[PDB]
């Protein structure tokens, strides 16, 4: 089965909780030993494809949410600085309390980011163990093993956190963390890759940066330090800018802002609210986390989109990392690849629709054939020439090695021998499946509707709270507005999702 988000919507899953709190990382799932030659090659490819997808869903595809990390860091730093200020502490103590909150929060962000990389290197190490141990296969049968010069590398190794060849990274907290490395053996010399160092930069590096996993003519690159280095550098820029900025903020506020002027002890931070929602059941977490990361959102305008490449229709709300790409308009086609920022879409996956054209017209004795893989959590509803409608779930379609999907529909049919005139796909799910996806492929807004008034509007309006700076959030009004804008955005999504 093909993933609905990945293929059907030409999108990516969104997990941004790692930038807000301690996040649950997807554990290593390396193929077992004792497998057949083909199955190991297949499972190594599947293990790398799933790892690339989960690393993209959380870290790699969301590099533009770090502006929200900067905003979140400032909220906690300023609150702690205001507490010490209201208590009549020395400027030193006010700044120390602020910096500790910056360092404590950014350690949780750095740790989540490096644990995601560590789990990938650890899983790679157990892949390379299973590959070497397999009697019929070597590393070159599953990996490209080429460098920039298109020459075969001496060896591809993975040193998990704790290993002698794993790097030691100092967190904002001042504590040390071991980070796993992707090793390229060059004899006596060796290349080590981690999110901090990235690639070496010469032709001795892996042809495509990270290991290239190949199986049955299809291949993929993952664990590419070139994709992790810009995220680390921007995260490191944020840590340095918030530290220097809060030192400036404290100097501008100390003496000027009097004790009792600002009262933010009773205030529940957007980060805290999203952490609380993560502990319970309710609205979809990625949008709760995206609101907490102060990403411009249009909660009030429901848009029905058509993913151009597949024809999949989906109703939902938009979120833009950079509202400069916006305002998105009704009837217009948008290419997210031309956008300066990233496009997010919160929708009920149970409402995914779309015309299915990847089918064979001839029904050979009840056996209906599909020329493309059906999507996960969906069912292909076929309309026969004798006006008979039958829906078959994705898991009930049987695959052949020649890229076709068959299912015996003779028990549900009266006229087994017929021709399929029409076909469409719809969700299998009975309950709501609200989720946030990142739009990668082109899409057209077929309609825009204001959810409160119920009217058909022509443009979108993105809302976010004022971002933090070294001179702002020095008044009660500013802090009360932050609290209120967050509360009304959460309530808006909580109302729409029930
Ligand atoms: C497939 O068919 C079974 C009956 O054999 C049905 O109960 C189930 O809902 C279907 N779902 C999948 C994904 O196989
Ligand atoms: Cl490789
Ligand atoms: Cl990756
Ligand atoms: Cl790099
Ligand atoms: Cl979600």
Residue numbers in the entry: 1 to 498
Quoted from the paper:
Haloarchaeal pleomorphic viruses (HRPVs) infect archaeal hosts living in hypersaline environments. The virions contain two major protein species, a spike protein (VP4 and VP4-like proteins) protruding from the membrane surface and a smaller membrane associated protein (VP3 and VP3-like proteins) residing mostly inside the virion. Here we describe crystallographic structures of VP4-like spike proteins from two pleolipoviruses, HRPV-2 and HRPV-6, showing that these proteins have a unique fold, different from class I–III fusion proteins. VP5 is thus a bona fide fusion protein.
In order to characterize the VP4-like fusion proteins (termed VP5 in these viruses) from HRPV-2 and HRPV-6, we purified them from infection-competent virions using either detergent (HRPV-2) or protease digestion (HRPV-6). After protein purification, we determined the structures of the HRPV-2 and HRPV-6 VP5 ectodomains (residues 1-498 out of 533 residues and 9-498 out of 537 residues) at 2.5 and 2.7 Å resolution, respectively, by X-ray crystallography. The two proteins, which are 67% identical in amino acid sequence, share a highly conserved V-shaped fold (r.m.s.d. for 453 corresponding Cα atoms: 1.6 Å). The structure is composed of two elongated domains roughly equal in size and linked by a single residue (Q258 in HRPV-2 and Q262 in HRPV-6). However, the last 35 residues are not visible in the electron density. The first twenty N-terminal residues of both VP5s are hydrophobic and predicted, by several programs for analysing hydrophobic regions of proteins, to form a transmembrane helix, indicating the preference of this region to partition into membranes. Interestingly, this hydrophobic segment is shielded from the solvent in both crystal structures by the C-terminal domain. HRPV-2 and -6 infect different host strains suggesting that domain N2 may play a role in host recognition.
